[PDB]
Design a protein around this ligand. Structure first.
Ligand code: MH0
Ligand SMILES: CCCCc1ccc(C(=O)O)cc1
Ligand SMILES: [Cl-]
Length: 393
């Protein structure tokens, strides 16, 4: 009654061109079974959205990766927010919400925007750049580690530690095993910067530690909460900004509309998050037998959500394969949905907005002038190299 497919969604063939296989998964039915890894899969918008908004049935405490924490030891201590269900999740989420709050964005907006404008000026003087290393990576590295309050030395561990966290959500393929086999130096760096003494005052990390007085989190919880932001806060925005530049390179008609109204910068980024979905997939675990779209799913089973596929489901979106910077993007699941919805989305949207704003005002054309290279990750989608030529406005 549930179709069985042999598609491996964690194979290099799938990462290269996931959209044909994603249509196959959507059209096979609301719920499929993935024989390769012995998990259920949901790829339409309706079921992906329903799983995300039923945290009691589809829990996160047994892991949001393939590994089931009731069966295998986690490779690192589980996240206190990402891999926690209510009520345990509520207090750490509230703290992170207040740290990354609307009121907090007012404190950083001018600095984030100025660094965005400075970087575009620096790239325009170079002309032929790599939009990944020189922009998608360079810009967030110049604002987020400082916003975190991190020291200057050692920041080369941040992106490797991030790509390790997102590879480790996947199955035990070579991508995951090769990452974990090199983890120790990055884990040691990250775990040290989470201690209150090593975080500059006024930064995100210090603010989390200051929330131990309220009774929302204890002092021993604060280091793992800083770890969350160092795990989720950098590589996702890199891939998001990378995707936006990619989209503007592939759809010059949208760059022209953006140039003619730079207030579209925020929705241009949001649409790139829908269109590319930097976070492609992750898992939930069923706490009971549950009927999902006419198919019953036993207790203790892993359910794989295709977030990128749900952001391109024609049953929910009009012309989903088109990059449209004036689309009503509200309702996309690129930031998740429900109680776990990305608590750092204001930081991501801010970085994306001010960077697309800088490009909208300073750049007249973005032309790909070199081999594009994809970066392969079990959970992240994005580019390794994007050779582009920037033409000043
Ligand atoms: C500064 C911090 C920060 C930034 C920036 C950030 C940027 C991004 N993120 Fe995202 N992310 C951050 C910190 C988190 C946390 C701590 C959590 C876990 C929240 C919870 O309650 O479990 C999270 N993000 C949760 C999520 C989830 C939902 C996970 C789940 O349901 O299990 C998604 C899909 C996500 N993110 C995507 C993205 C994308 C896409 C971007 C950027 C374009
Ligand atoms: C399922 C991946 C969502 C992004 C993410 C990664 C890590 C954390 C964390 O370390 O808590 C949170 C969210
Ligand atoms: Cl770690």
């Amino acid at each position: 009654t549930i179709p069985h497919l042999a598609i491996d969604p964690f194979s290099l063939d799938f990462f290269d061109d996931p959209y044909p296989d994603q249509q196959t998964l959507r059209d096979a039915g609301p719920v499929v079974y993935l024989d390769k890894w012995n998990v259920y899969g949901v790829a339409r918008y309706a079921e992906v959205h329903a799983v995300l908004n039923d945290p009691t049935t589809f829990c996160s405490s047994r892991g949001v990766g393939l590994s089931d924490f009731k069966k295998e030891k986690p490779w690192r201590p589980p996240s206190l927010i990402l891999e926690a269900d209510p009520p345990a999740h509520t207090r750490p989420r509230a703290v992170l919400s207040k740290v990354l709050s609307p009121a907090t964005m007012k404190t950083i907006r001018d600095g984030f925007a100025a660094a965005a404008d400075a970087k575009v000026d620096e790239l325009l003087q170079r002309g032929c750049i790599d939009a990944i290393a020189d922009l998608a990576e360079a810009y967030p590295l110049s604002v987020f580690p400082d916003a975190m309050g991190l020291k200057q030395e050692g920041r080369e561990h941040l992106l490797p530690y991030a790509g390790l966290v997102f590879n480790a959500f996947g199955p035990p393929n070579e991508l995951r095993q090769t990452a974990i086999e090199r983890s120790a130096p990055h884990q040691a760096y990250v775990n040290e910067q989470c201690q209150r003494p090593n975080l500059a005052p006024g930064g995100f990390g210090a603010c989390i530690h200051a929330f131990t007085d309220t009774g929302e989190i204890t002092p021993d919880e604060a280091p793992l909460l800083v770890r969350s932001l160092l795990s989720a806060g950098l590589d996702t925005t890199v891939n998001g900004i990378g995707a936006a530049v990619y989209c503007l390179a592939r759809f010059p008609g949208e760059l022209q509309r953006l140039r003619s109204d730079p207030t579209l910068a925020r929705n241009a980024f949001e649409e790139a998050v829908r269109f590319e979905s930097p976070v492609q997939t992750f898992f939930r675990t069923t706490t009971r037998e549950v009927e999902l779209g006419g198919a019953v799913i036993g207790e203790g089973e892993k359910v794989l959500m295709f977030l990128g596929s749900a952001n391109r489901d024609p049953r929910r979106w009009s012309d989903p394969d088109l990059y449209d910077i004036t689309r009503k993007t509200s309702g996309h699941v690129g930031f998740g949905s429900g109680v776990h919805m990305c608590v750092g989305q204001l930081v991501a949207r801010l970085e994306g907005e001010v960077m697309l704003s800088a490009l909208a005002r300073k750049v007249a054309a973005i032309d790909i002038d070199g081999p594009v290279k994809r970066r392969f990750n079990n959970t992240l989608r994005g580019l390794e190299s994007l050779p582009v030529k920037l033409t000043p406005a």
